[PDB]
Amino acid sequence: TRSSRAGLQFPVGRVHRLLRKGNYAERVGAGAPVYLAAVLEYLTAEILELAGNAARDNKKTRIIPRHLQLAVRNDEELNKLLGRVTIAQGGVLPNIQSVLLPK
Amino acid sequence: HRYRPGTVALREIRRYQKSTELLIRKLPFQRLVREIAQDFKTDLRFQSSAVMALQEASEAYLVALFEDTNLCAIHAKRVTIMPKDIQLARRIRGERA
Amino acid sequence: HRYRPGTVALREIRRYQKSTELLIRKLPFQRLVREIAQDFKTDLRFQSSAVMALQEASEAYLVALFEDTNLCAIHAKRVTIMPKDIQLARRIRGERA
Amino acid sequence: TRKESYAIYVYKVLKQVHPDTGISSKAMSIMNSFVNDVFERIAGEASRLAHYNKRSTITSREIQTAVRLLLPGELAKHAVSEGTKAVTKYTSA
């Protein structure tokens, strides 16, 4: 498999097919699926790293949508990449305005 | 002779809303573009139309921002735009967190 | 005893910002979806996941809208959200003309 | 009917960053939807890149310059690091 030859867990073969049948260009050169599969594997690793930490902080071992929302909205760059994206059953960050707190 | 504070401003609003010329001077804006671009990559050149496209887009962005900024100032029962009006506008339209 | 006005209001904010469940009743929302869809095409059916997808997007849209609405009220030295705050948020967002 | 997803692949990634953690079906679809969206966003930028330059091929270079346009600075820097590493390793083997 091309995934093992690239050292990746994501399917290099499946990515190459989706680039062909996606009507992105007349021809898809080699390495482009392994490059994209590695970028997709890295980004999933980045979210699962921060979401798994959110699960351990929330005293749970299984990552729920709440743990994915906490991981993305607390990271400056994942929030900017997913700015126009809605994560279902994720809720919002705890944020109370200072002028609304009592004295 | 002296005009009261506000009559010349409203006169300028009508003057520049009827016209379409660029309001930033060409050479200062061009040096700013080259300076910012130089920090990204050295040894860069620009087509004369590429800079004009940047000034046409930057000025149109700021004017549209000054409109939403003016609405935030008027929303707070004010006539003067303040930095907090700009930041609130940039936050609502999604440019800020 | 009796809590002062605004005490349990902040308690509700901390309660609902901590949870992720839906806040609109599903059946009244489902009847609202089928009513609006009836005006575009008659004799339509909806998947269970299709109605829940609309409710997840509708609540997340409104919650984000109240966040912008709340900021407009604070910008006007107020703590109560008013229709003029929603209209300003949607105007700056580009939704309302 | 045979439906495909990235479920088995995000597990192998999850076990490398957190071996003693799990993931629910709700969060699994969210991860599955996240991969497809980023896949389309990157491949779409790479498509326009080839069209803008009158070229017919989407190689690893179009994928790289598409990552630098789509991902934020610090995320894009490490993504190119992961991308360039896998390509040179795929060529050696």
Partner: peptide, 16 residues
């Protein structure tokens, strides 16, 4: 694993 993960997760500063 071999993932070159960024060591810092900065919080986005929001309005107010």
């Amino acid at each position: 694993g071999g993932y070159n993960l960024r060591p810092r997760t900065y919080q986005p500063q929001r309005y107010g």
